[PDB]
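Study this protein:
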Amino acid sequence: AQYEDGKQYTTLEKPVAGAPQVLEFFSFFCPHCYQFEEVLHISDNVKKKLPEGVKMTKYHVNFMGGDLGKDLTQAWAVAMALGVEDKVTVPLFEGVQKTQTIRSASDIRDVFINAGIKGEEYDAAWNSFVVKSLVAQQEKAAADVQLRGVPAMFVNGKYQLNPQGMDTSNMDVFVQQYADTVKYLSEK
């Protein structure tokens, strides 16, 4: 076929019922994740090709960067709860990997402050049980698919994107193949 199991994607041995339609995992410590976000804009190009009615989910993971890694998962929960993903994603990536000015939870907090979220608003969220359960959701979703690496994308709890099996000589052609594959899997 043109799209082959084990080629542009893999199938999960143990499918995850009730899973989000399109589910993406990343870490602010993850070098290909930085690329996916700032250079390739994967999430956004996938969204542009997805049918109508399909929702897109993105979760942070704990297994990179130890204690800070976990702080970043809680901070990503804060971002989701406040709806400010699009204002903190870039400065978090840059703060962790480019300038390396993020070294503590307080430095993560500074990014939200500078992005205009109120200190008050941030700290209340950070400590909120809504954010607790939002952290739980991120962990459970990652726990459900034996996730040991990022970036990762899963479609309908059954298919996992396989970017290793796509041409990378051109960055734009790679992105479209990726997105087209998500669309194919979505319609499957």
Summary: The helical segments are 31-39, 42-49, 66-82, 85-98, 105-114, 119-127, 129-144, 171-187.
